[PDB]
Subunit: 65 residues, 6 copies
Amino acid sequence: GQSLQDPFLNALRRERVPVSIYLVNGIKLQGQIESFDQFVILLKNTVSQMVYKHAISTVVPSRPV
Amino acid sequence: GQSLQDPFLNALRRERVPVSIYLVNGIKLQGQIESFDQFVILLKNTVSQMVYKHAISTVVPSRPV
Amino acid sequence: AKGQSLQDPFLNALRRERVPVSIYLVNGIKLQGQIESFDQFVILLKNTVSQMVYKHAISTVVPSRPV
Amino acid sequence: AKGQSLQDPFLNALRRERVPVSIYLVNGIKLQGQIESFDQFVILLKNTVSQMVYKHAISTVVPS
Amino acid sequence: AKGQSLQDPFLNALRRERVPVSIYLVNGIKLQGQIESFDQFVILLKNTVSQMVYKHAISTVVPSRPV
Amino acid sequence: AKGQSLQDPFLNALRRERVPVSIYLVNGIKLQGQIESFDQFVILLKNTVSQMVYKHAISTVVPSRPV
DNA sequence: CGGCAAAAAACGGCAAAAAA
DNA sequence: TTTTTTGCCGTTTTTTGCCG
Ligand SMILES: [Zn+2]
Ligand SMILES: [Zn+2]
Ligand SMILES: [Zn+2]
Ligand SMILES: [Zn+2]
Ligand SMILES: [Zn+2]
Ligand SMILES: [Zn+2]
């Protein structure tokens, strides 16, 4: 979890808000949160890839929340 | 103990002090601290972005306290 | 949103169908191959030779034809 | 030793005696300053404005 | 599957048969050598010197000699 | 093996015998010195000035001569 | 307008691992 | 070792949207 992360990701997932995930290496990924558990986030754009949280630096929701 | 990270972040949150969050890759993220939990800091500039703590090196206030 | 409820079904789905995957590491290195098996911290990637890949060095796991 | 033992007294001795330190991060950035407080995960740096340093970014802590 | 059900039998298999291995770090450095021993966090890479490699710095462990 | 069977006896042996070691970090910088002491997360390394080295920044601990 | 069911998020018990 | 803490999972209770 939890507390501030999970409701944030859930709110972003429900409203299909486009997001810009920034990895620690600098690479930006775009798409929508399809699912997420404690360690990974299922990012969906034209393919549906699994992204490890430990590699993620920031999750930037493209439209105000 | 986790007892120096909380009172710090809450102090910053309460005083609405503009901070500079450095990432491990050298990126500087200026803005306000909306809320936080064990592993994420919510950071508020033109958009509320979620920042993973594990990607953060230093959190530098522009003010004291 | 529960611990490990998504990663395991995802990887198991990728392996059981032997779907070709591209595993991007945190350093940029792309590892093309097929998930042969996985556990809590590692993923055994099989292409030419079965190499063990640590998950903490993994950024993304991208399937090449949908799962 | 075994279990969170050497780290705490090292930082404590650095804090009590107000000893100036240079903190080398995993990227290469050198942060000189003074240790005001510390806990399991973070370290106050004092210097000009108390700045919070995450240990997971810290490579080493060298006394002066 | 789960836990270390895979990374332990793998490293063990690399250690009993004493196959030469190739340990890529997350920084790009390649470490050829041979698994002498390992525990939860470290791996003993024997060569001219036995060096202790931390798992959190390891990205891929490839069997050369493979098979 | 499991646990810290192998990482504690190694560092302890390197400390008892005051063996000079080269500690490589994940960024490539090569520290050198002598294990004064160590615990779960850090290693106290003593050379011209004693310093505290976080294990999470360490890739390998390479002795000069055997264990 | 009132139950019905999906889902979240808070509560609590369990048991491995840290601390003493 | 003993004792304690804490992250780990399973449950309940509340919400919310659909359906009756
Ligand atoms: Zn995290
Ligand atoms: Zn941290
Ligand atoms: Zn690991
Ligand atoms: Zn991970
Ligand atoms: Zn640490
Ligand atoms: Zn470690």
